[PDB]
């Protein structure tokens, strides 16, 4: 399977006083491994996974210098964008950036990406070929031209196909005990009478990793979506994820219904019957 390294950055302007609030988080697949918060006293990139603590003082120093420089970049951006969108100095605005790289099952570069948003809307993104840009509006055309002229795409491409993949591979190895371990969901069904004549069947998937999963109900071997409820996948807080899907059924007919669970942690899909 493929693996990903992604960094997420949020800067929020504080028009009343001071510099923007800046929060940066790094993930390998669905695991957070580093963070920086401008509001924290340490003013350092901090570890969030045990395997990144294998890296020495030189790592934390280098990552901190870069992440602080990135915060100043965003600070500049917030001022520039206020001007592009003719907004007043009194409202708070948001810049978000995500970038990262994937390696495939062959452990080689697969994909790179770099996306930017302003006030919750696409602004500019690097195209899949890592050579050109997609501007969502006329303001972003200005940025696209500036970045084309300064060959930003080439710089980012060299990073994405080089350093980014090299370090992802390094992290995967160092963290193999957890990053490359799949946790199959622990599944069970609960049953709740809502009356003397019908019942709710809830099919649970717990403690799974990674987050991707499919849960579906069938009745007599056909997909059933009517009269079901499916919650969004949610973090358990210990690095694993949870999901459930429920269906309401006539009392005594429970045996017709099957819960189907698909997850990379499973040799083949599971079929549950009450």
């Amino acid at each position: 399977g493929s693996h990903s390294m992604r960094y997420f950055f949020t800067s929020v302007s504080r028009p009343g006083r001071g510099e923007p609030r800046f929060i940066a988080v790094g993930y390998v697949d669905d695991t957070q491994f580093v963070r920086f918060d401008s509001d924290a006293a340490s003013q350092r990139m901090e570890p969030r996974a045990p395997w990144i603590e294998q890296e020495g003082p030189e790592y934390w120093d280098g990552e901190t210098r870069k992440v602080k420089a990135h915060s100043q970049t965003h600070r500049v951006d917030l001022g520039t964008l206020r001007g592009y969108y003719n907004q007043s100095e009194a409202g708070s605005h948001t810049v978000q950036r995500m970038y990262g790289c994937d390696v495939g099952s062959d452990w080689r570069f697969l994909r790179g990406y770099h996306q930017y948003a302003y006030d919750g809307k696409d602004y500019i993104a690097l195209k899949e070929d890592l050579r050109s840009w997609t501007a969502a509006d006329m303001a972003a055309q200005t940025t696209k031209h500036k970045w084309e002229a300064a060959h930003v795409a080439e710089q980012l491409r060299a990073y994405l196909e080089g350093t980014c993949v090299e370090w992802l591979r390094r992290y995967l190895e160092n963290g193999k005990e957890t990053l490359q371990r799949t946790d199959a969901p622990k599944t069970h069904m609960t049953h709740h009478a809502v009356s003397d004549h019908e019942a709710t069947l809830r099919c649970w998937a717990l403690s799974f990793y990674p987050a991707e999963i499919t849960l579906t109900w069938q009745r007599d071997g056909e997909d059933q979506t009517q009269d079901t409820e499916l919650v969004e996948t949610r973090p358990a807080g210990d690095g694993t994820f949870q999901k459930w899907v429920a269906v309401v059924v006539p009392s005594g007919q429970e045996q017709r219904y099957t819960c189907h669970v698909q997850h990379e942690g499973l040799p083949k899909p599971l079929t549950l019957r009450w």
């Binding site: 960094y7 790094g26 990552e63 870069k66 992440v67 420089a69 990135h70 970049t73 500049v76 951006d77 520039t80 964008l81 950036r97 970038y99 930017y116 602004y123 500019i124 200005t142 940025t143 500036k146 970045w147 300064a150 930003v152 710089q155 980012l156 990073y159 350093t163 980014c164 090299e166 370090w167």
Partner: peptide
């Protein structure tokens, strides 16, 4: 490992 991010919009 972060990329240096100097390019402003």
């Amino acid at each position: 490992n972060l990329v240096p991010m100097c390019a402003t919009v």
